[PDB]
Design a binder for this molecule. Structure first.
Ligand SMILES: Cc1cc2nc3c(=O)[nH]c(=O)nc-3n(C[C@H](O)[C@H](O)[C@H](O)COP(=O)(O)O)c2cc1C
Ligand SMILES: Cn1nc(O)c(C(=O)O)c1COc1cccc(C(F)(F)F)c1
Ligand SMILES: O=C(O)c1cc(=O)[nH]c(=O)[nH]1
Length: 381
């Protein structure tokens, strides 16, 4: 009963319920990152079921659960977070220059509804410093066989005062792209003014094509170099995903889907936080995007819509209110190939990955599936 390396060790839940009621949200988060920075977190290095693995094109996820963007904005404890049991992490969102973000306090919890509202505003150390942090992980990954198949994506955005979003996305590609297994284009943060306008079809199309061209030029101009270009897990060109906001009318969603089909995006992350929820009186006079259990149903329906609007041709990364194995299977049967957690880590703590992986495997048994891949999109028939 001193096996503190186990993520289900009873003391973690005790400290977490105390943090939930007494300690500011962002302070809790930085404490978590500090523990990870000094390699003090517990870990689960045990073998995941081969029957729950999954892929998005050439990305082979050893299990279906990763950590959503914004949890390690700066990529300072990638190793430790992955070793909790996750198969991947999306670091960022990063911007070309660093930013302190919007005013504090700016992260608020509501345990009753297991929901969060945040107005962070892309607080990050900037692309060049996060790149150095990612490079250090990649060098450790080379020596550590036990991280050889874990995946790291990078969410990229724009500084608050940048005029043309595309300039900032290009800068991030040219510095950090060679180290990422995939790039997530963030056009859906509710906390950078004017950012969500880039989900307009014409603007979005130009953004996607510009990003893909820059990644292609990066390879075009550098694959001949002595040092092997792709210092990442896949040893290939990063795939490109788009993260969308749930707050869109049906016409926009269809017009976006048309653009995703034409531009050949490699996947879509559905979804970001919402500004549609106001029936949480603890959040009643706060600003930003709402995460957690109150976002689950909205984003699951959104997965179903974009799965159908893209005629099942665009793989889907699920994000939004995933806490349980039942939640994960709802997302997958809705059309998702992988799931991302944030709010689950806030309210369930260290045990998040180990327990949700166990619950999913039990579900795949009880529901009669041979493997997780068989369940993808099964709601639609
Ligand atoms: C404090 C906080 C910070 C976040 N920062 C980012 C970010 O930088 N980039 C991004 O694409 N999403 C960000 N998100 C959104 C999450 O990645 C995720 O999409 C959202 O929380 C919904 O998932 P959940 O219900 O499991 O929390 C953030 C969410 C929270 C609560
Ligand atoms: C509690 N809380 N509130 C937040 O806004 C966040 C966050 O990350 O956004 C968190 C997560 O923080 C911890 C989670 C598990 C365990 C611990 C502890 F440090 F207690 F072990 C902290
Ligand atoms: O950093 C933020 O403010 C932020 C970015 C994002 O994409 N989603 C979110 O909820 N907050």
């Amino acid at each position: 009963m001193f096996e503190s390396y186990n993520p289900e060790f009873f003391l973690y839940d005790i400290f977490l319920k105390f943090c939930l009621k007494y300690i500011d949200g962002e302070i809790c988060h930085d404490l978590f990152l500090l523990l990870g920075k000094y390699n003090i977190l517990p870990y689960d290095t045990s073998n995941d079921s081969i029957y729950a693995c999954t892929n998005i094109k050439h990305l082979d996820f050893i299990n279906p659960f990763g950590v959503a963007a914004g949890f390690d904005k700066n990529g300072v404890c990638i190793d430790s977070i992955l070793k909790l049991g996750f198969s991947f992490i999306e670091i960022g969102t990063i911007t070309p220059r660093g930013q302190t973000g919007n005013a504090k306090p700016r992260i608020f919890r509501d345990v009753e509804s297991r929901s969060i509202i945040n107005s962070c505003g892309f607080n990050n150390m900037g692309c060049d410093k996060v790149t150095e942090n990612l490079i250090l992980f990649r060098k450790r990954q080379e020596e550590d066989k036990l991280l050889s198949k874990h995946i790291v994506g990078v969410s990229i955005g724009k500084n608050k005062d940048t005029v043309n979003i595309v300039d900032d996305l290009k800068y991030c590609i040219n510095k950090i792209g060679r180290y990422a297994d995939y790039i997530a284009i963030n056009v859906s943060s509710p906390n950078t003014p004017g950012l969500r306008d880039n989900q307009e079809a014409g603007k979005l199309k130009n953004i996607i094509l510009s990003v893909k061209e820059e990644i292609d030029n990066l390879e075009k101009n550098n694959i001949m170099n002595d040092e092997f270009l792709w210092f990442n897990t896949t040893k290939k060109k990063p795939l490109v995903f788009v993260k969308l906001a749930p707050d869109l009318n049906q016409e926009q969603k269809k017009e976006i889907a048309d653009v995703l089909l034409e531009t050949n995006i490699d996947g879509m992350i559905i979804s970001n936080t919402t500004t549609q929820i106001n029936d949480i009186k603890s959040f009643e006079n706060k600003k930003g995007g709402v995460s957690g259990a109150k976002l689950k149903d909205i984003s699951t329906k959104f997965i179903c819509e974009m799965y159908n609007y893209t005629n099942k041709q665009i793989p889907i990364i699920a994000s939004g209110g995933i806490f349980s194995g039942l939640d994960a299977l709802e997302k997958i049967e809705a059309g998702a190939s992988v799931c991302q957690l944030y709010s689950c880590l806030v309210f369930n703590g260290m045990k998040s990955a180990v327990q949700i992986k166990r619950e999913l495997n039990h579900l795949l048994y009880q529901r009669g599936y041979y493997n997780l891949k068989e369940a993808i999109g099964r709601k639609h028939s």
